[PDB]
Amino acid sequence: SGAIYVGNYRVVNRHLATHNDWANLVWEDSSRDLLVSSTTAQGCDTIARCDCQTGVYYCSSRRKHYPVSFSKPSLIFVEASEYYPARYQSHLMLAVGHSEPGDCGGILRCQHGVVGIVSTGGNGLVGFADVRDLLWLDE
């Protein structure tokens, strides 16, 4: 699991969004596996505004942070699961790395800050949902 807390927002994987996330919906994108809900107290996570393709991500199946190089945000065909049917998820960055379903939520970080959260995985690869384009998060 896991989330990013920036300002008066909470950023989770859409498929893991709780009842309170839906009761306080701000923005959501099924094809991005993203959901933004509102928070009462002030979040202080810094979002990265960069062009990076190297980062370090947290992996709870190992309790380890991994240094990885990843692709630029794009459309990747994500196989069917119980949360979604066979579809193309947009804004997804792929890296060669380990992951398990319970790892969705771990953050990929660079020197600039928070790049995105773990979203997909399979075949010795791990995918991250990018959040760097969401400029409205800091205002």
Ligand X SMILES: COc1ncccc1CC(=O)N1CCC[C@H](C(N)=O)C1
* Binding site listing: 50, 52, 110, 112
Task: Please classify residue 5 by burial: count the beta carbons closer than 10 Å to its beta carbon, then call 0-12 exposed, 13-18 middle and 19+ buried.
Answer: middle
Sheet containing 4-13: which strands, arranged edge to edge?
4-13, 34-44, 25-29
- 48 interacts with Zn ion by CB under 5 A: yes
Under rule CB under 5 A, residue 52 binds Zn ion: yes
134 sits near Zn ion (criterion: CB under 5 A): no
- Sheet strands (E) in 4-79: 4-13, 25-29, 34-44, 54-59, 64-69, 74-78
| 98 is known as an active-site residue | no
72 scored as a contact of Zn ion (CB under 5 A) = no
Q: Is 33 a catalytic residue?
A: yes
Nearest distance in Å: CB 53, ligand X: 20
Rounded distance between C-alpha atoms, residue 78 and residue 132, angstroms: 21
| Smallest separation (angstroms) from Zn ion to the CB of 117 | 15
118 vs 137, beta carbon nearer ligand X: 118
Active-site entry in 21, 91, 104, 130: 104
Question: Would you say 17 or 115 has its CB closer to Zn ion?
Answer: 115
